[PDB]
């Protein structure tokens, strides 16, 4: 309590310059170290850690407003191409192109036994349509599930993403403002410590 109100500070000082940026986003990650061979930080959750963390968000905010997209990402160029997807799971038109430059990232500390949470600050700009005409598959893809449960300020993101045959479960917490500049405060961080740990310690 009293240590999460230092970190939400020391955030906070840290990303205060970047809140004039347009287009920013913040995020705070669950995942783990060394669990994949050629990376250092993996934002992934166990099977059944996933399924966990599901109904607990399932129970504790029926009420609250719940999307839910499949989509087809490609990666080209530093971009980020989102695709609609048909019923079968594949790409249909390409509906954004965003690019992704990371401007403050944070490792925060976890209680021992608890999933590590990272937290990110970037801008994510929109840009030029026309480059879809490269196509989904001009480069590396990733079909996503996502569950979005929004919750006042906060976005919880439950995603299956399959990449290369293979699935993966991400879990991830967004800020949702209407002006970040104006609504990403100390306490908005704080409390998003309050949400992240409770997701990261339910075992
Ligand atoms: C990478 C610089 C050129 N470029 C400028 N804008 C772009 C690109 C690009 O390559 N790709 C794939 C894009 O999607 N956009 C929007």
Same mark, same amino acid.
């Given at each position: 309590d009293a240590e999460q109100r230092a970190v939400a500070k020391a955030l906070f000082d840290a990303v205060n310059k970047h809140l004039? +940026?347009? /287009?920013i986003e913040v995020e705070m990650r669950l995942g783990q170290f060394?669990? $994949? $061979?050629? #990376? +250092? /930080?993996? #934002?992934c959750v166990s099977t059944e850690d996933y399924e966990r963390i599901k109904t607990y968000l399932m129970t504790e905010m029926e009420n609250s407003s719940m999307t839910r997209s499949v989509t087809h990402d490609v990666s080209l160029r530093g971009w980020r191409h989102t695709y609609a997807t048909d019923e079968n799971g594949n790409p249909t038109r390409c509906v954004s192109i965003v690019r992704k430059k990371r401007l403050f990232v944070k490792n925060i500390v976890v209680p021992l036994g608890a999933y590590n949470l990272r937290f990110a600050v970037s801008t994510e700009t929109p840009g030029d349509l026309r480059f879809s005409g490269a196509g989904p598959r001009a480069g590396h893809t990733r079909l996503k599930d996502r569950l979005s449960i929004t919750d006042g300020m906060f976005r919880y993101d439950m995603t299956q993403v399959t990449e290369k045959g293979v699935l993966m479960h991400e879990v991830e917490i967004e800020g949702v403002f209407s002006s970040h500049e104006k609504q990403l405060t100390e306490s908005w961080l704080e409390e998003l410590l309050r949400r992240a740990m409770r997701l990261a310690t339910l075992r």
């Open positions: 004039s +940026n347009p /287009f060394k669990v $994949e $061979e050629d #990376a +250092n /930080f993996t #934002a």
